[PDB]
């Protein structure tokens, strides 16, 4: 992280599509370097729904400028998760904060 920041890093990372954002809050069910599995809350499920969401993390792919695009899980097991929370740090990102 940058020690001296301007407070925009959170917003810039959130809006930018680099990071994975959990579309529904809940408690995390499964964590792995490649995929993440989330369990939604009781009040969040669609009536008649599985209640489980899955994301696949881009591990190592070529960028447009031949740089590297990687993603890192950044949550612990059984971690509560709110909506809009950052679930997978992308490149140049730390805990949802931009880190060039």
């Amino acid at each position: 992280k940058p020690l001296v920041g301007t407070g925009m890093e959170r917003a810039v990372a959130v809006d930018s599509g680099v990071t994975a954002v959990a579309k529904r809050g809940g408690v995390v069910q499964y964590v792995d370097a490649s995929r993440i599995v989330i369990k939604v809350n009781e009040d969040e499920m669609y009536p008649g729904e599985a209640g489980i969401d899955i994301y696949n993390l881009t591990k190592y792919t070529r960028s447009n400028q031949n740089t590297c695009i990687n993603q890192m899980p950044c949550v612990s097991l059984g971690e509560p998760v709110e909506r809009g929370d950052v679930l997978a740090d992308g490149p140049s990102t730390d805990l949802g904060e931009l880190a060039l």
Binding site: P2, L3, V4, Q65, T67, L100
Partner: protein, 50 residues
């Protein structure tokens, strides 16, 4: 406020501290600014252009 933060952390308020030369060992005559800077790496790799 930056001075107050510095004094909370017990650092010298002036922000300039004394240093020693690695190879010679005597103090630099005047205190030298030492701090923490955010430095980046740019795409102009020297081994690519050479």
């Amino acid at each position: 406020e930056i001075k107050e933060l510095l004094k909370l952390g017990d650092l010298p308020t002036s922000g300039q501290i004394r240093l020693y030369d690695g190879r010679t060992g005597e103090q630099f005559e005047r205190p030298v600014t030492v701090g923490y800077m955010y430095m980046l790496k740019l795409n102009h790799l020297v081994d690519d252009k050479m």
